[PDB]
């Protein structure tokens, strides 16, 4: 398992590293190809829309025809998309690359989630999902760093590197993932987790994407200060995801843990609103994301638990609605931020309270059922 789980973690890391690889080099591509702002908005939207559309079907196909096949095809698609972006000198080629990348993500993430759920002992699933969330975050962190480090020779080298990594990951998955040994439909158990993940993503991506702008406009944070705050928050979140998430899973339930994390998030966000000092903002930023960083593995575990033999479908639903929230969040957040500097934090607090209400309602329904 320590070799199959490692290759699954590598696949998910590759997907989320390729996601963030494009940030440092987007203006260079726009200037080189003579693209407008409408083109930039379309290029951003295409990947997210493709992932949204493909993720549930990808998970269903992983359930039906086997997860290893869907993962391998998704890795092939990832390599094709990265190479297409590497050699693309036209807007249509770039849009096709983004679409193929979104489809590859919507095929790889549901399959990897379902397989990690399937090959895990019942007492180890939570730890594995916490590790997966930490790996996803690490890929997000390392994407832009490698993309900007390897753009000093050419703004197209990162995508050649990413395509090569996709080839290596596909070969590793073919060799190392075990072939399957052998081999719900109700749309009522999945309603609360999809609503929860959608609301939480919509309100949390709003605060995450505009954090640097908010800190620069509020407390005069230089780029190194924002980097310090982001790295401290990421270190604390990773430490809690890797070490404490599974211990909380044995003690509490998924819903109780989610509610407590959301209440902690509300408290710390309120404390962040009323902070105007440099060191106050730094110290609050260090700990303001811990509950949010632990909510994602908890939601993945809840999706896994409420499912039966449809782990891939649960992964696909999670991917679809997480990406939907992550796309719609910052767009609304920036419009609100133009009128008040504290608007994204207000959206985060509001969605946290709504999530607490949703979790409590679902817990009460469960108690009434039993």
């Amino acid at each position, epitope marked *: 398992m320590n070799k199959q789980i490692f290759v699954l973690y590598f696949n998910i890391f590759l997907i989320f590293l390729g996601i963030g690889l494009v940030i440092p080099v987007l*203006p260079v591509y726009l200037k080189d190809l003579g693209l*407008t*702002g409408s083109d930039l908005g379309l290029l951003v939207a295409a990947f997210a829309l493709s992932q949204m559309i493909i993720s549930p079907f990808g998970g269903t196909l992983a359930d039906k025809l086997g997860k290893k096949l869907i993962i391998c095809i998704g890795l092939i698609l990832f390599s094709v998309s990265e190479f297409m972006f590497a050699v693309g000198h036209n807007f249509s080629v770039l849009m096709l690359s983004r679409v193929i990348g979104g489809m590859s993500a919507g095929m790889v993430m549901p399959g990897v989630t379902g397989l990690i759920a399937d090959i895990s002992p019942s007492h180890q699933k939570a730890k594995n999902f916490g590790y997966m969330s930490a790996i996803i975050n690490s890929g997000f962190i390392l994407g832009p760093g490698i993309g*900007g480090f390897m753009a000093e020779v050419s703004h197209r080298m990162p995508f050649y590197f990413a395509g090569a990594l996709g080839i290596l990951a596909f070969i590793m998955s073919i060799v190392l993932i075990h072939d399957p040994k052998k081999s719900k439909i109700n749309w009522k158990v999945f309603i609360t987790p999809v609503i929860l993940t959608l609301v939480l993503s919509f309100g949390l991506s709003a605060f995450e994407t505009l954090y640097s702008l908010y800190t*620069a406009d509020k407390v005069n944070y*230089s780029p190194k200060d924002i980097s310090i705050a*982001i790295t401290g928050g990421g270190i604390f979140g990773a430490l809690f995801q890797i070490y404490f998430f599974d211990k909380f899973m044995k003690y509490f339930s998924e819903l109780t843990f989610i509610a407590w994390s959301l209440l902690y998030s509300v408290v710390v966000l309120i404390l962040l609103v009323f902070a105007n000092d440099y060191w106050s903002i730094m110290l609050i930023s260090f700990v303001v994301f811990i509950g949010f960083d632990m909510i994602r593995p908890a939601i993945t575990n809840y999706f896994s638990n409420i499912a039966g033999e449809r782990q891939g479908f649960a992964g696909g639903l999670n991917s679809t609605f997480t990406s939907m929230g992550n796309f719609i*969040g910052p767009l609304i957040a920036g419009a609100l931020f133009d009128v008040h500097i504290e608007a994204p934090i207000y959206m985060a607090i509001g969605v946290s309270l709504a999530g607490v209400v949703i979790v409590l309602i679902e817990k009460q329904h469960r108690a009434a059922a039993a």
Partner: antibody
Amino acid sequence: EVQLVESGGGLVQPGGSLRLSCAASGFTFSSSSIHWVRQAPGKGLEWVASISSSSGSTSYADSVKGRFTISADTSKNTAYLQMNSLRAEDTAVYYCARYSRYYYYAWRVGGYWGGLDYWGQGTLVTVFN
Amino acid sequence: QMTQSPSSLSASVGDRVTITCRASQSVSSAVAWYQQKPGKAPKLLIYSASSLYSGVPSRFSGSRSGTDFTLTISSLQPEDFATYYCQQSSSSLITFGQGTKVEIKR
């Protein structure tokens, strides 16, 4: 994709009022605002006013506050700049521009790109009569 | 509305040019760059990007040094002889640069 067209500029009396219109068309995956920027003959660029497309919130320059009023109507996606008590320093070419911000989510890192993406042709306003 | 150095410079095609804009000390947000040719509207040249991302080499590269910002043109192509403006945003207002004109030498 988006087009901005100015209208309503011309000769005005030194003390009268004049209304500029910016007609805007086109859709983008961004947060947008409509701004007015004037250029005096031979001089640089000066920002004068701004209004938000959603939850319309106005903003004005210090040298123009009180005299000017920006508004928008979304029935035809149009913006208006009504300037009253026009003075000597108000003769310039007025452009309406579109500030657009695009977002790319990636955890607590991630890109945004903002600027005055689209500009109009501009209309000349001469205050002295 | 913001100080730009130099006010006007002249250089030959193929040369590398740097334009410095002195930005606000009350905000630390990035700066957008605009290009204007005579008789036409200004054109957005460089977007205002996230503070974490600024410095990737390119033909038109923006670089933040302390409180100042720098626009670098690596290769002076013939059609980029124009006036260049820096723009900074804030809570609600917008500030433009004084303007630097680039002229062709002979």
